[PDB]
Design a protein around this ligand. Structure first.
Ligand SMILES: Cc1cc2nc3c(=O)[nH]c(=O)nc-3n(C[C@H](O)[C@H](O)[C@H](O)COP(=O)(O)OP(=O)(O)OC[C@H]3O[C@@H](n4cnc5c(N)ncnc54)[C@H](O)[C@@H]3O)c2cc1C
Ligand SMILES: Cc1cc2nc3c(=O)[nH]c(=O)nc-3n(C[C@H](O)[C@H](O)[C@H](O)COP(=O)(O)OP(=O)(O)OC[C@H]3O[C@@H](n4cnc5c(N)ncnc54)[C@H](O)[C@@H]3O)c2cc1C
Ligand SMILES: NC(=O)C1=CN([C@@H]2O[C@H](COP(=O)(O)OP(=O)(O)OC[C@H]3O[C@@H](n4cnc5c(N)ncnc54)[C@H](OP(=O)(O)O)[C@@H]3O)[C@@H](O)[C@H]2O)C=CC1
Ligand SMILES: NC(=O)C1=CN([C@@H]2O[C@H](COP(=O)(O)OP(=O)(O)OC[C@H]3O[C@@H](n4cnc5c(N)ncnc54)[C@H](OP(=O)(O)O)[C@@H]3O)[C@@H](O)[C@H]2O)C=CC1
Lengths: 466, 466
């Protein structure tokens, strides 16, 4: 029973989880990474972005609050060089501790610095970063190559000095004027962060914000953004980009827009063109994403794929869960990833959080539904904070009354969404959820209150009644 | 089938919930209140305190943050007159909308302004606020008279101008120096609020903070308090209070302590001495609390009790839940209050939150346990915030591995505790909890990470792995 030889391409959340699990299951791992160890999350994604957003939150609350009648506010001076140094130090520390140190301190793992492609379904050719090549033979291989920022084909954009999320996060100055092309998670998390740290921000949204989500979400976020001075140009696209006399000049229907920096946040495409997937019989879809089943199996039985390079949702917790289960299956087990109560959080303020079905998604799947939308001016916590921006929306199956989805725009929406996720996992009805005790003056109490509106008027119920 | 005549004494969370439910069940309610409509929660409790604490939070973050290297901070000027006006306006608005307007706009409810006592088990004598008396006959009666701040018998205290929570919340100035006697929820929520709004605060704790809770809680809170300049004198009591030359002078073992204002927060005693409970055969315990079963039944079958005047936990959500169920039982039903997954939240920063059993409580009930304590320096969200004060502690039944309690000291602990409450309600094991997807970079993810440490090393696991 020789150790199974497992090859892993990448070192992000999917690859790390797979490598560690494979080792735990008795395999010898060869991990190939072309760039910085740790991939997107630690280096240019979740961690640095959430740090910058937290800095932004502090800046914002120093600038303004619902309590300014009685607490003086100031325009705080911002030293982005110091903020960036702090951010990078945590990134570097986490990469060393949770990635480099975990791979380096493990004798069942060989790390190769190079770019891999398939030679056949049992071997990779690696172009080594120090030059030349090496062949890596494997019994099983996990492709976990992630994704990269997409670039729309706008004339003049390619040759201009524009930013993706990577360059934005690595910037050592807050630009006076920031233009943002895009209208989803990356665009809006970063637009609000930059605005709060001092930029005059203009968002060019080709449709409306969060266009593919329940429309209540985009409506609430758009209003929030406008309320703190972020310009949101809906149904607006740039037809030309130019960079002249040190600034960006964007041609749009709304007229000419000028800015010091331009962030383009228009999706992330799977990193698969360099892999020679045809050499291993691994099928992709029209977007270039590797097609997998619930066991992370590709069209080739020796090759698995996990994370953003596949057709599954792009979140680090999905990538990791998928990597872990791919490893089980590569080492003789039988695991499947279940996404039925997969929550998602957008780190704007207020936060967006979702889990399960929107009304529209349920209808498209042939489910009969009812819903209730509780505005935050009904939530004691929001009233005590004097900030009632947002809502909590509950979606149920008609008849069974089973909770099947929740969408919320609220401060701490990301915290309360997990109570909704566990309710859905446990197949609870809204009456059962409403019957549980919740602490008074928490945002999560809003789930109880929303659940109660399926049977009675919120305005006619007394404090913590239920 | 004549309408059942239900009398309710009080107008707080228990009484309101009962009155409304009784009416919904077809009864005619006579509600007797000696003071301001709405009782403790709306007027002098939960609502005004959480408002003041939120004001304090803004003041604090304007003063200091983990991002001060790159974001300038100031000592904000505080106008407590304006803050108090804002606070009171929300209190007054909520009393009108959720209490007065709900009672006044209901023809099945008669409100009597006076102090009730029992004449016998079918009638009350009410001393009317406008003078004279009235007898109220009833079929069933709910006693929901709440509690009042307790006063320890310290020489000189009684005749000094000290504060309870009521006077503290109603104060129009921030005192330069505030002394606090007490070491539990009221003392510590208000001590930190006043400190953050500008007071130099000294807490006299007769033992340690949160003495009756898992000791990890008090340790974390004490450290937090000291870290922001609140003096915590453990194992310290005042043996004499004097008020001389405009200031309080407290004699203690640590020597003489002087302050401008003194808050005494040493418990809340049930309001039952004025009720003539012996006239109706209603038994109290040694503390004066009305003894009730899970159906809120007293020793007299026609008389029920709910909220802080009983021996059940003192929270507005318990009082309301109990009032609602008492009403069901007063109108021919069969309901019981289940407190097995009753969460609790303390609105310090970081928050304290608990649900279910501590290790000690489990052991005292004959349950065999294991536990894990995850320090917050292991939680991505806390690391991204550069604030790793606190912990998340999980308690399980040995063998079954069922989660039976959670104690947490963390920002947003009150939000994440509800996920723990639902896990416990649904009888989940820690492995089952750990197997659920949680969003990355939320505080609630900490529950997943803690759950995972029952089977493996946190430090050896990669980002969002599970
Ligand atoms: C700004 C930003 C913020 C985000 N915030 C969040 C968040 O808050 N929460 C959340 O859940 N998700 C977030 N995401 C998404 C999350 O970061 C990704 O879903 C997750 O990191 C994907 O992990 P992965 O392992 O699939 O890929 P990656 O982490 O991208 O790793 C893939 C690795 O493979 C390497 N590679 C590619 N091709 C080859 C090859 N041929 N040979 C060798 N090496 C190769 C790449 O260099 C890369 O290091 C964010 C993303 C961005 C961009
Ligand atoms: C500062 C503070 C902060 C708090 N914060 C929280 C929190 O964040 N969350 C939480 O869950 N709980 C909190 N509590 C506790 C919560 O407020 C109480 O548990 C809850 O309000 C109790 O409700 P109740 O209906 O039992 O009594 P109450 O609201 O006290 O109502 C009792 C009423 O009966 C009246 N009354 C008494 N005797 C008679 C009589 N003989 N005749 C006529 N009328 C009478 C009283 O005047 C009073 O209005 C807090 C308490 C305080 C003091
Ligand atoms: N908190 C978290 O969980 C985070 C997660 N992520 C992950 O990364 C993924 C990628 O994020 P993101 O880049 O925001 O992309 P998304 O795939 O979420 O959305 C694509 C965005 O690009 C717009 N778009 C596409 N093409 C064009 C074009 N030619 N011109 C103008 N706009 C265009 C879309 O507009 P329209 O909608 O109108 O079509 C939409 O706003 C996310 O979906 C998420 O899974 C990223 C950051 C944070
Ligand atoms: N967020 C929330 O849920 C809130 C809830 N409440 C509710 O109201 C209740 C009452 O709160 P609180 O007044 O804090 O009382 P608690 O009953 O929680 O605690 C009593 C406190 O008084 C101290 N004490 C008692 N006698 C003396 C004495 N002679 N000298 C010095 N100290 C003394 C105790 O010390 P030791 O512990 O050492 O014995 C302890 O600190 C709470 O238990 C809670 O149920 C109140 C505020 C907020």
């Amino acid at each position: 029973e020789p150790p199974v030889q497992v090859a892993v391409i990448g070192s992000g959340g999917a690859a790390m989880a797979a490598a560690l699990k494979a080792v735990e299951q008795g395999a010898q791992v060869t991990l190939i990474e072309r760039g910085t160890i740790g991939g997107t999350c630690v280096n240019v994604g979740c961690v640095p972005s959430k740090i910058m957003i937290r800095a932004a939150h502090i800046a914002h609350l120093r600038r303004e609050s619902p309590f300014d009648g009685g607490i003086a506010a100031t325009v705080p001076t911002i030293d982005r060089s110091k903020l960036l140094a702090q951010q990078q130090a945590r990134v570097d520390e986490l990469r060393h501790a949770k990635y480099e140190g975990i791979l380096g301190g493990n004798p069942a793992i060989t790390v190769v610095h190079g770019e891999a492609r398939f030679k056949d379904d049992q071997s990779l050719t690696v172009r080594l970063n120090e030059g030349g090549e090496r062949v890596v033979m494997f019994d099983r291989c996990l492709v976990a190559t992630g994704a990269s920022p997409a670039v729309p084909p706008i004339p003049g954009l390619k040759e201009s000095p524009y930013w993706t999320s990577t360059e934005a996060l690595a910037s050592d100055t807050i630009p006076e004027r920031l233009a943002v092309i895009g209208s989803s998670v990356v665009a809006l998390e970063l637009a609000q962060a930059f605005a709060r740290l001092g930029s005059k921000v203009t968002v060019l949204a080709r449709n409306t914000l969060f266009f593919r989500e329940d429309p209540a979400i985009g409506e609430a976020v758009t209003a929030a953004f406008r309320a703190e001075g972020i310009e949101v140009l809906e149904h607006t696209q740039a037809s030309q980009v130019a960079h002249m006399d040190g600034e960006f000049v964007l041609t749009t229907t709304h007229g000419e827009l000028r800015a010091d920096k331009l962030l383009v946040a228009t999706g992330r495409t799977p990193n698969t063109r360099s892999l020679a997937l045809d050499a291993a019989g691994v099928t992709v879809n029209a977007q270039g994403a590797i097609v997998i089943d619930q066991g992370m199996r590709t069209s080739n039985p020796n090759i698995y794929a996990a994370g953003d390079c596949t057709d599954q949702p792009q979140f680090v917790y999905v990538a990791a869960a998928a990597g872990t289960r791919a490893a089980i299956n590569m080492t003789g087990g039988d695991a499947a990833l279940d996404l039925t109560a997969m929550p998602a959080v957008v780190f704007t303020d207020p936060q967006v959080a979702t889990v399960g079905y929107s009304e529209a998604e349920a209808h498209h799947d042939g489910i009969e539904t009812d819903s209730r939308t509780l505005t935050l001016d009904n939530v004691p916590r929001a009233l005590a904070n004097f900030d009632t921006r947002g809502f909590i929306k509950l979606v149920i199956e008609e008849g069974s009354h089973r909770l099947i989805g929740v969408q919320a725009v609220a401060p701490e929406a990301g915290e309360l969404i997990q109570t909704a996720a566990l309710a859905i996992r446990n197949r609870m009805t809204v009456q059962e959820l409403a019957d549980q005790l919740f602490p008074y003056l928490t945002m999560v109490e809003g789930l109880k209150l929303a659940a109660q509106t399926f049977n009675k008027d919120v305005k006619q119920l007394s404090a913590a009644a239920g």
